[PDB]
Amino acid sequence: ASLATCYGPVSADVMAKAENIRLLILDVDGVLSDGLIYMGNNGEELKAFNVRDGYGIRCALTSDIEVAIITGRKAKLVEDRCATLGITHLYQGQSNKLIAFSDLLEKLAIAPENVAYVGDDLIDWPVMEKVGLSVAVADAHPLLIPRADYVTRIAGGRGAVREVCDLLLLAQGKL
Amino acid sequence: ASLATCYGPVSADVMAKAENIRLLILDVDGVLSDGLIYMGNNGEELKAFNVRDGYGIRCALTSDIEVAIITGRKAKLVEDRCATLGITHLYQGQSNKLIAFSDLLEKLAIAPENVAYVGDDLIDWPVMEKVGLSVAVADAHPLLIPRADYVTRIAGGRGAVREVCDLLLLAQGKL
Amino acid sequence: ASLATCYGPVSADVMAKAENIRLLILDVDGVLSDGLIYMGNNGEELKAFNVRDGYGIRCALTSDIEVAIITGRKAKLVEDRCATLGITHLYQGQSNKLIAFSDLLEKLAIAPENVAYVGDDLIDWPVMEKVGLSVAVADAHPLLIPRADYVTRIAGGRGAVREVCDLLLLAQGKL
Amino acid sequence: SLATCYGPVSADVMAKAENIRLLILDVDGVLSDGLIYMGNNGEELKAFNVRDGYGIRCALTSDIEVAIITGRKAKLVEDRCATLGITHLYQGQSNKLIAFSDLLEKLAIAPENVAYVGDDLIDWPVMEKVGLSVAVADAHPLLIPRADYVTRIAGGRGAVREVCDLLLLAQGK
Numbered sequence: 141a142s143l144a145t146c147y148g149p150v151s152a153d154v155m156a157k158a159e160n161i162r163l164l165i166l167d168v169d170g171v172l173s174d175g176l177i178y179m180g181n182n183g184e185e186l187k188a189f190n191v192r193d194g195y196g197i198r199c200a201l202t203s204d205i206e207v208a209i210i211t212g213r214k215a216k217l218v219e220d221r222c223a224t225l226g227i228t229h230l231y232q233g234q235s236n237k238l239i240a241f242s243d244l245l246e247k248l249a250i251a252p253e254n255v256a257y258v259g260d261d262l263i264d265w266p267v268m269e270k271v272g273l274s275v276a277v278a279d280a281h282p283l284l285i286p287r288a289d290y291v292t293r294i295a296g297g298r299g300a301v302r303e304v305c306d307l308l309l310l311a312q313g314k315l
Numbered sequence: 316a317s318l319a320t321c322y323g324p325v326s327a328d329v330m331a332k333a334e335n336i337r338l339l340i341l342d343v344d345g346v347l348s349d350g351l352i353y354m355g356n357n358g359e360e361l362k363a364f365n366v367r368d369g370y371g372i373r374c375a376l377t378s379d380i381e382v383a384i385i386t387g388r389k390a391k392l393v394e395d396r397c398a399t400l401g402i403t404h405l406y407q408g409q410s411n412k413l414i415a416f417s418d419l420l421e422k423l424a425i426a427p428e429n430v431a432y433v434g435d436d437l438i439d440w441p442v443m444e445k446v447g448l449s450v451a452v453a454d455a456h457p458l459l460i461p462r463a464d465y466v467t468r469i470a471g472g473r474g475a476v477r478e479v480c481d482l483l484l485l486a487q488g489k490l
Numbered sequence: 491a492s493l494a495t496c497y498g499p500v501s502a503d504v505m506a507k508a509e510n511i512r513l514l515i516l517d518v519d520g521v522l523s524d525g526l527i528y529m530g531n532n533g534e535e536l537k538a539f540n541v542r543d544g545y546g547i548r549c550a551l552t553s554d555i556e557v558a559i560i561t562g563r564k565a566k567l568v569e570d571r572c573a574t575l576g577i578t579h580l581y582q583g584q585s586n587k588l589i590a591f592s593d594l595l596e597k598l599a600i601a602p603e604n605v606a607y608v609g610d611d612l613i614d615w616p617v618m619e620k621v622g623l624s625v626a627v628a629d630a631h632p633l634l635i636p637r638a639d640y641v642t643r644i645a646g647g648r649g650a651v652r653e654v655c656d657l658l659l660l661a662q663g664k665l
Numbered sequence: 666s667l668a669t670c671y672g673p674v675s676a677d678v679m680a681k682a683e684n685i686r687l688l689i690l691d692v693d694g695v696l697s698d699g700l701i702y703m704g705n706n707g708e709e710l711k712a713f714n715v716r717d718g719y720g721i722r723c724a725l726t727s728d729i730e731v732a733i734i735t736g737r738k739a740k741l742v743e744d745r746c747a748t749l750g751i752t753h754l755y756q757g758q759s760n761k762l763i764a765f766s767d768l769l770e771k772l773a774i775a776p777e778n779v780a781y782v783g784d785d786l787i788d789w790p791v792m793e794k795v796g797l798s799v800a801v802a803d804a805h806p807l808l809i810p811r812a813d814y815v816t817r818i819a820g821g822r823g824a825v826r827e828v829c830d831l832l833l834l835a836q837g838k
C-alpha cells in the first residue's frame with residue numbers, strides 16, 4: 141500500500157486516486173508562481189513562472205489529461221502563459237471557484253472523482269473538498285496542508301506542478 | 316497562558332492584545348514587500364507583493380479591522396496596491412510616522428491600545444513603542460526583533476502580514 | 491582516488507574526464523538561469539542570469555575551452571546574454587538537441603569525449619549520454635541527478651556554471 | 666571577543682573598523698544577490714535591498730564615505746547611487762586597482778583607512794590592500810578564508826547593512 145516515486149514514497153490510495161484523473165486544475169498564484177506580484181510605477185505587472193512545470197503541463201496535455209486554471213485575478217500575462225502552453229480552460233476573476241468547477245464537470249462530461257486540484261490557500265478548499273485528488277503545495281497555508289490527500293515535496297512555483305504531473309503520468313502508465 | 320495557532324503557539328498576553336485591535340498599520344518595504352527594490356535601465360521601479368497577504372487584508376477589512384499603510388516615499392505602485400486591496404488609509408512620504416499615527420487615531424476615534432503595527436527596521440520603533448500590539452517580521456533587523464510583542468514565523472513579503480491578520484481574527488473569534 | 495576542490499571533493503574519474511574538455515555546452519533554463527520565466531501584462535519576458543557564471547565562462551573561453559548554448563526557443567535576451575559573455579556558438583529554436591550537437595562537433599572538429607554538457611531536465615539526457623562529461627545541476631530533475639557523471643553543489647542560476655568552469659580549469663591546471 | 670547584533674566579532678576586526686573613512690562596495694552579489702534580469706526588449710533589472718540603503722545613508726551622515734567600483738555599466742546603478750547620495754561611482758572597471766588608486770588621492774586617505782566588501786576573486790587584488798576586507802556570506806568559496814571579516818548575511822539580503830552597522834559600532838555611533 142505504498143509506492144516509491146522520485147520525490148519519495150506515496151501511498152497506494154493517492155496512486156489509485158491519481159490513476160483516475162482526467163482533469164488537473166491549478167491555481168496560478170502560489171502554485172504556478174511563488175506567490176509574488178511585481179508592480180511598477182506605471183502599470184507594469186510581472187509574474188514568475190517555472191519552466192519545468194511547463195514541460196509537465198505539455199506532457200499531461202499530450203497524455204489525455206486536460207489542464208484547467210481557476211484564478212481570482214485577471215491578467216493578460218496569464219492569458220499569454222496559457223496560450224503559449226496550450227491550456228484553453230482558463231478561468232479568471234473567479235471569487236467562488238465552485239462555479240468554474242461545475243462548469244468544467246459539465247463541459248468535459250466528467251465526475252468530481254476524475255478531477256485533481258492543486259491549491260495553496262483556503263479559498264481553494266471548497267473545490268478541493270469535492271475532487272478525486274486534492275493537492276497542497278509544500279508551502280501552502282498551514283491549515284490547508286493536513287486537509288489534502290497529497291502534499292508536494294516541492295514548493296509553489298518551484299516545480300510543484302511538475303511533481304503532480306509526474307505523479308499522474310506514473311499512475312496512468314503514461315509517464 | 317499560551318495558545319495554539321496555525322503558525323505555532325503564542326502567549327495569552329499576545330492574544331489579549333490582538334483581541335482589542337481595531338487598526339492594523341503596515342509598512343511597505345520589508346513587510347508587504349520582500350524588502351527589495353527591482354530597478355531597471357529604463358528607470359523601472361518594481362516591488363514584489365505576496366498574494367497570501369492580500370486575502371488576509373481583505374478578511375481583516377470585512378471583519379471590522381481597519382488597515383492602514385504608512386510609508387516614507389511616494390510611489391504610484393503603492394497607490395495601485397492599496398486600491399486593489401481596498402485600503403483607503405494610505406500615508407506616503409511620511410518622514411514623521413507619529414503625525415500619521417495621531418491623524419489615524421483622531422480620525423477613527425481609537426486609542427493607541429487598539430492599534431497593531433508591523434515593522435522591520437529601527438525607524439519603525441518610535442511608533443511601535445506606542446501601540447497595543449507591536450509586531451516584527453521574522454527577517455526584521457536583529458535589534459528590533461527582541462523589542463516587539465510578537466515576532467512572526469514568516470518573513471516579510473512571504474505571508475507575514477497574512478500571519479498577523481490570521482492572528483487578529485483568531486483572537487477576535489472570526490477565523 | 492579523490493581530489494579537493496573549493497566546492498568539495500571530486501572523484502579522480504570526474505577529474506580525468508574534465509581534463510579532456512575542449513567544449514562546454516550549457517542549457518539556458520535552470521542551468522544558466524534560475525529556471526523561472528518572468529512574464530508581463532504588456533508582453534515582457536525576463537530571465538535571471540548570475541554574475542558568478544559570467545566570470546567563469548570568460549575564463550573558460552580565454553583558456554582554450556569553447557562554450558556553446560543549445561536551446562529550445564529563440565529569444566533576444568539569450569542572444570544579448572551571449573554577446574556580453576562572448577559566446578559565439580548559439581543554437582536557438584532547436585527541437586532536436588542531437589542535430590545541433592552534431593553540427594557543433596563538426597563545425598569545431600571535436601570528438602564527443604572532449605565535450606561536457608550541463609543540464610537540468612530529462613530532455614537533456616539524450617545529448618548528455620553521448621558526451622565525455624555529463625553534469626546535472628544540484629536542483630535538476632531528481633531522475634537526471636543519478637545519471638550524471640557530476641552533480642554540482644550549487645543550484646542552477648546561482649553559480650553552478652561557475653562551479654563547472656572552475657572544475658574544468660582546475661583539471662587542466664588553469665584555475 | 667566583542668558582541669554585536671549579528672554575533673561575536675574579534676577585537677582585531679573592530680580595531681580595523683574604527684579606522685575606516687571609506688567603504689567601497691561591489692554591486693553584483695554584494696548590493697544585489699548576483700542576479701541579472703534580462704528581457705526580450707533589452708530590459709535589464711537588478712534587485713537592491715532597502716535595509717542596505719538605510720545603512721549606507723547612516724554611513725554617509727557619519728563621516729564615512731561610500732564608493733562603488735563595478736565591472737558592469739548600467740544607468741540603474743547610477744539611479745541607485747543618486748537615491749542614496751553616493752557620489753563616487755566607477756563603472757566598466759575591468760581592473761579595480763585603478764579606481765582604488767583614484768579614491769585614495771581624491772579623498773587623501775591611506776589603504777588602511779579603507780574597507781572593501783566583495784563577492785568574487787576579481788575583488789581580491791583590492792581587498793588584499795585595504796584595512797578591512799569583507800567577504801559576504803555567500804561569496805565565492807575561495808574568497809571567504811581570505812577576508813578579515815565574513816558577514817552573516819548573504820549579498821543583496823542585508824550584508825551591506827551589517828557592515829555599516831559594524832563600522833558605526835566601532836566608531837561609537
Ligand SMILES: O=C(O)[C@@]1(O)C[C@@H](O)[C@@H](O)[C@@H]([C@H](O)CO)O1
Pocket residue numbers: 169177211212213364365366367368369370371372373399400
Ligand atoms: O496578494 C494579495 O494580497 C491579493 O489579495 C491582492 C489582489 O490584487 C490579488 O493579487 C489577489 C489574487 O486574487 C490572488 O491570486 O491577491
Ligand SMILES: O=C(O)[C@@]1(O)C[C@@H](O)[C@@H](O)[C@@H]([C@H](O)CO)O1
Pocket residue numbers: 539540541542543544545574575693701736737738
Ligand atoms: O553576470 C555575469 O555573468 C557577467 O559576466 C555579465 C557581464 O556582462 C559582466 O557584467 C560581468 C561583471 O564582471 C560582474 O558584475 O558579469
Ligand SMILES: [Mg+2]
Pocket residue numbers: 167168169170171259260261366
Ligand atoms: Mg493561491
Ligand SMILES: [Mg+2]
Pocket residue numbers: 342343344345434435436439
Ligand atoms: Mg520599513
Ligand SMILES: [Mg+2]
Pocket residue numbers: 517518519520521609610611
Ligand atoms: Mg534546460
Ligand SMILES: [Mg+2]
Pocket residue numbers: 541691692693694695784785
Ligand atoms: Mg560581484
